[PDB]
Design a protein around this ligand. Structure first.
Ligand SMILES: [Cl-]
Ligand SMILES: [Cl-]
Ligand SMILES: [Cl-]
Ligand SMILES: [Cl-]
Ligand SMILES: [K+]
Length: 217
């Protein structure tokens, strides 16, 4: 694997593992499972420690890069403003989850982390047939190159030491060797919400480097 991706065996707890992964890498990808409360809660609890570890930038799928100005206004108005701003595109995945996502963005912001958007508009119909489901995901993954360009631009705009990119885990598959396709090499995190396993290095597949054990809703 790319020597810039440093894979350290998880340091116990969920917070300790995430901070340790950011401490060991200039770029970490958090593979989101939309609707799962554990992931945004984890980021909220890690915000201050991540900042201290050198994380100055958090680039998120939930905001379109083109809406940066409007989002920064919401981020200052507070959690309630961020939720209303994200609802149009992201409320579909649950009120509680959208609330926790908003809390995580706010907690990162007030911890001194620059929060910016990576997403780009792209309309696709709901997939019903087997082939539509496949084409839909392939089309979505075509945005990786643009997600990466937006995350790069905004990291540089604030001279970030380390950055985290937070987006749908499907975009970070087959990332073991060189990180996500059409994106910069980085440590990719996935989540095991079965409550069985523990945080670990991923050996089942090459869709992430480490798996953080969490709780399902
Ligand atoms: Cl844009
Ligand atoms: Cl608040
Ligand atoms: Cl089609
Ligand atoms: Cl997706
Ligand atoms: K890559």
């Amino acid at each position: 694997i790319n020597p810039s991706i440093n894979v350290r065996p998880p340091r116990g707890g969920p917070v300790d593992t995430l901070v340790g992964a950011a401490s060991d890498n200039n770029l970490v990808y958090i593979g989101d499972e939309h609707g799962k409360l554990f992931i945004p809660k984890l980021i909220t609890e890690s915000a201050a420690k991540l900042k201290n570890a050198g994380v100055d930038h958090l680039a998120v799928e939930f905001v379109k890069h083109s809406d940066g100005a409007a989002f920064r206004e919401a981020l200052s108005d507070g959690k309630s403003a961020v939720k209303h701003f994200l609802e149009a595109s992201w409320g579909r995945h649950g009120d509680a989850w959208l609330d926790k996502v908003s809390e995580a963005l706010c907690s990162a912001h007030r911890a001194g982390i620059y929060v910016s958007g990576i997403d780009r508009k792209m309309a696709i119909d709901q997939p019903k047939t087997p082939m539509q489901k496949i084409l839909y995901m392939k089309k979505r993954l075509a945005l990786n190159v643009a997600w990466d360009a937006a995350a790069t631009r905004e990291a540089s705009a604030v001279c970030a030491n380390k950055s985290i990119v937070w987006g749908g885990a499907g975009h970070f598959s087959n990332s073991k060797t060189d990180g996500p396709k059409d994106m910069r090499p980085g440590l990719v995190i996935s989540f095991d919400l079965t409550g069985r396993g523990s945080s670990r290095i991923n050996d089942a597949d090459e869709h992430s480097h480490i798996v953080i054990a969490g709780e399902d809703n």
